[model samples]
Target: ATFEIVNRCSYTVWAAASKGDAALDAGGRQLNSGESWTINVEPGTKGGKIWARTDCYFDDSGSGICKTGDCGGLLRCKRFGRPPTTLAEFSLNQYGKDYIDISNIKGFNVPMDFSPTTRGCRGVRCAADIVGQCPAKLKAPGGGCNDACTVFQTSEYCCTTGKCGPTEYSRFFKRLCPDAFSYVLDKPTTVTCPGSSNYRVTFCPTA
Candidate 1:
């Protein structure tokens, strides 16, 4: 199967992705409004994720910076990217189906819409303007809202060291985008896509 990443925003969005233990690939291209990148995902691919990095300034040697979702200052990523990103995560062809999600559990940078190409698969989305309304305590400086677990790290926010559930802090996000994951323990955010489905991940879909 393949992942066709499309940038639908009015401005630029540098999309990046990681799969298993392999090096990151983006077709040596940067997405500039309505552009897209296609990556082939072989069978048995696991732990895959795609995200859009914004406010970036990179050079020929890949030494530069990004305001959000920087993957260790490298244009060609080999390690995991940081949060405050719009993540489109998936496990391709696993258990005879595909697992997909749009998560703000770590944080969110921009809006995203994820769609499945196959007939039996369901499409998913988190296409909301979140950074504009991020709470002060959970806001990441450059962009987006940080998850309660990432910001507070307390047992209540992190849902660890004791029992925990939704709070008013997390509810802010949950109410705005009901289809996305607002916290670590939000289970309903995930969906399944089946049968050789090729996904189309669009950044800034609302724009």
Candidate 2:
């Protein structure tokens, strides 16, 4: 028996395929707007799957039906039912000349770091360190360092010793590569403000 395939969608379809559950091999050609093609198939073949594949570069919403050019131009296939898995089931009556084949994909993960500094000040120097107190240290409560005022409130000893001041500077570090790990100060590094001085520094995760 001969079957005629028609393109009823607004956009032109490129390659199309039809498949059956049992052993049946039949193919057809491309069909344009109201265009149809005849294909011969054996009798007793059960109803199978039909799909139209296109190379349309629009987003994957499946609703983009605007035609930009002829059927041979960057045409994208749009199907009404489930997509076909094999090529033997359906045949493409209209073949798009320019199309992209996306069959495989790859993935990976990476690491990154960032830092920032303050403006000019005195007796002050900052670095990204995960160790004990040096100049300005990151305190608890907010997982960040306190400004000069709050630093004084927390540690009165620094006021007497003068080795370190109430002035606080901190660096924030995090993994910016891959979409896995989040930011953490312990595993990463942060910026610190030198004592009694104003300075500025900046950092960002390297891609």
Candidate 3:
């Protein structure tokens, strides 16, 4: 997901790191308008902490009354911990239009998982006796010249590649409409395909 960060102050913000800490920089520039970054994750190899900060300054009288002190307000800082393995980051700019992808990280993968349901579309079953012979009643009701009607009563009727055509429809129907009869096209139901183990990259906003 994208995340957004805002520079709601009157001065430009500069970023830096603490002593001995791994220096984290924006893609290459400072956070001007708001900035965005995308992080790529690899399954089983992701876990860490990240932080950011900005530099600010305060204006003093020409006399330089406060020159020797911490004149500017405190620096702004933000921190993120244990980001999701699939997280992506992004940023928005001044026009509220110009945006950037700063993370620039890549090659992250999350596993996809799914399960089968008995409520799903049913498989087709044909008896061995009807394999090669077509039944007379299998003829179309209107006596039309249609193959679908011609093989209508053969156990192998409507069979393609040794599988029943109608059964394929049933399985798809069950996946899409679990509550209705698998053979009924008019009924409505909800079914979902199982997930697989695949990895893809995405972005998230910091703000």
Candidate 4:
């Protein structure tokens, strides 16, 4: 399936993606508002994810840091990014269907919309004002909102023991993005779409 990463935010964003050993889009790309980058995903690519890094500056060598979603301070990401970043994850061709979701489990740095462009599949978006309403404990240093697990890293929030439920902090994100994966073990947010469907991930999307 093909994935289009679009930037609709007022500021710039560096889009990034990772699929195990494979680095999509050479790891990342700088995208100003109204700019976009498209990439094709291979079938059976399980646990693939796409995200964006904000407030970054890279020299000609593609080495720099981003306030949000920085992956080892590299312009081209080789792994999953840091916390306080929105994620659009997918497992394509799983039993002939594609499992997709917009997740705030890592927390949210920017609003996002993840949708199928071809087939009539239900899309997910997290465009809430989480940055403004962020709880003090879950707020990042410079900007963005962090998940409780990121801040505290307790079993209750991280589900390290595989036994946990939602808390007030998770509920705060859930209430805003009802269709998103707001916390660990948070079910009912994953959507199954036709394997052949194309997808689009938009940043800072409007109504």
For model 3, residues 130-157, the per-residue Cα lDDT tens digits are: 1123234322232211133123434443
lDDT ranking from best candidate downward: 4, 1, 2, 3
What are the clash counts of all predictions, listed in order?
0, 37, 26, 0
Candidate 1 structure quality by residue, lDDT tens digits, 45-134: 677778888888999887678888888887876555677776788887787888888877768888998888667767778876778888
lDDT of each: 0.78, 0.25, 0.23, 0.90
Error of 1 at 31 (Å): 0.5
Q: How much is 9 displaced in model 3, in angstroms? A: 6.7
**Highest lDDT: which candidate?**
4
Give the per-residue lDDT of model 4 (tens digit) for 155-184: 999989999999999999999889898888
Best by TM-score: 4
Give one digit per residue, the lDDT tens place, for model 2 in 113-155. 2111234221111222321232334332322222222333433
TM-score of each: 0.91, 0.24, 0.18, 0.96
Candidate 3's error at 22, in angstroms?
Answer: 6.4
The 10-residue segment with the lowest total lDDT in model 3: 104-113
Question: Per-residue lDDT for 136 in model 4?
Answer: 90
